[PDB]
Specification:
The PDB classes it as transferase/transferase inhibitor. The entry lists the keywords phosphotransferase, cancer, TRANSFERASE-TRANSFERASE INHIBITOR complex. The assembly is monomeric. Helix content is 34%, strand content 15%. By secondary structure, the chain is of the alpha+beta class. The chain has 2 domains: 102 residues, Phosphorylase Kinase, domain 1 (2-Layer Sandwich), CATH 3.30.200.20; 186 residues, Orthogonal Bundle (Transferase(Phosphotransferase), domain 1), CATH 1.10.510.10. The strands form 3 sheets. A 6-stranded mixed beta sheet has the order 1-5-6-4-3-2. It starts with 10 loop residues before the first helix and ends with a helix. The structure holds the ligand Cc1cc(-c2cc(F)c3nnc([C@@H](C)n4ccc5ncccc5c4=O)n3c2)on1. The ligand Cc1cc(-c2cc(F)c3nnc([C@@H](C)n4ccc5ncccc5c4=O)n3c2)on1 binds next to strand 2 and strand 4.
């Protein structure tokens, strides 16, 4: 790595992000995750159980100083509902490996769809509140997620929910839900996107608020696909007919009212993540 190529203020932070190969064993024999940009494997860090992501499906990782800079930013994030970066390990043959905490119970969507798990309505709302707290933190860091959805949050061994799939962990972990734009070629999660982002492909924290509303709907339907009878970019036409996802059977009325505020046609009128934490914690507190 070329320390000179970095912003001079960040050079000190590199030692805290870089993991020496001696400190990490990767078990390439068993894939635990699959993304478009690469596979994920069990690993042991010095005995800390971790998830090691390869980026080898990409032809190139871009500018190495930029990759490092991304890693440094990501490493300073610390919140119990945000997936942390443990570090990055430089291997001789191949791209760098990204080292994340192991998430025993996988992604939130699959967890709520799992027949062997039986969360209550209170539990599902609490999963939503935990996501809201993670997003309030990210928004306070002026970080825009761009791909918030239940598939992109994960659960650890204590069922703590963590906003995942950002920074160096960013990928498409379920290709079904990404559609190619015709003018730009970008693969977009159209069914989670705000109206304005469908039009401009610009994403903001207020478009993350829209996605969060969809995520709440996923939770209360225990992982149903949103808008099944709508096809890809016909979602814009569908929404502009004056439509929204219907209230799920076991979704409390005030929680559906929160969903509708998250889908406000004017981005600036949608609630902040701080407001969502406040409103959801109240609704959650009414359940036993
Ligand atoms: C479906 C699905 C979703 C994911 C997923 C979603 C994320 F938001 C996400 N963020 N980071 C990851 C990768 C790096 N990851 C992280 C931890 C982990 N722990 C246990 C098993 C697999 C993983 C994993 O794939 N993710 C995988 O993997 N399969």
């Amino acid at each position: 790595i070329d320390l000179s190529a970095l912003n001079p203020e960040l050079v000190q932070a590199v030692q805290h992000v870089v993991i020496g190969p001696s400190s990490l064993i990767v078990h390439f024999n068993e894939v635990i995750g699959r993304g478009h940009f690469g596979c994920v494997y069990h690993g042991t860090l010095l005995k800390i159980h971790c998830a090691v992501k390869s980026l080898n499906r990409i032809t190139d990782i871009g500018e190495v100083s930029q990759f490092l800079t991304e890693g440094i930013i990501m490493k300073d994030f610390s919140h119990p509902n945000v997936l942390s970066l443990l570090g990055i390990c430089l291997r001789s043959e191949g791209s760098p490996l990204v080292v994340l905490p192991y998430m025993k119970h996988g992604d939130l969507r699959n967890f709520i769809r799992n027949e062997t798990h039986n969360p209550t309505v209170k539990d599902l709302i609490g999963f939503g509140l935990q996501v809201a707290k993670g997003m309030k933190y990210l928004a306070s860091k002026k970080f825009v997620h761009r791909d918030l959805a239940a598939r992109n949050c994960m659960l650890d061994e204590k069922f703590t929910v963590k906003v995942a799939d950002f920074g160096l962990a960013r990928d498409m972990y379920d290709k079904e839900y990404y559609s190619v734009h015709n003018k730009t070629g970008a693969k977009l999660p159209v069914k989670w996107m705000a109206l304005e982002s469908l039009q401009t492909q610009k994403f903001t924290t207020k478009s993350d608020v829209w996605s969060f509303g969809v995520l709440l709907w996923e939770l209360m339907t225990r992982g149903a696909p949103p808008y099944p009878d709508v096809n890809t970019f016909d979602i814009t036409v569908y929404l502009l007919q004056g439509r929204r996802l219907l209230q799920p059977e076991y979704c409390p009325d005030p929680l559906y009212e929160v969903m509708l505020k998250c889908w406000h046609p004017k981005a600036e009128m949608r609630p902040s993540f701080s407001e969502l934490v406040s409103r959801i914690s109240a609704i959650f507190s009414t359940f036993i």
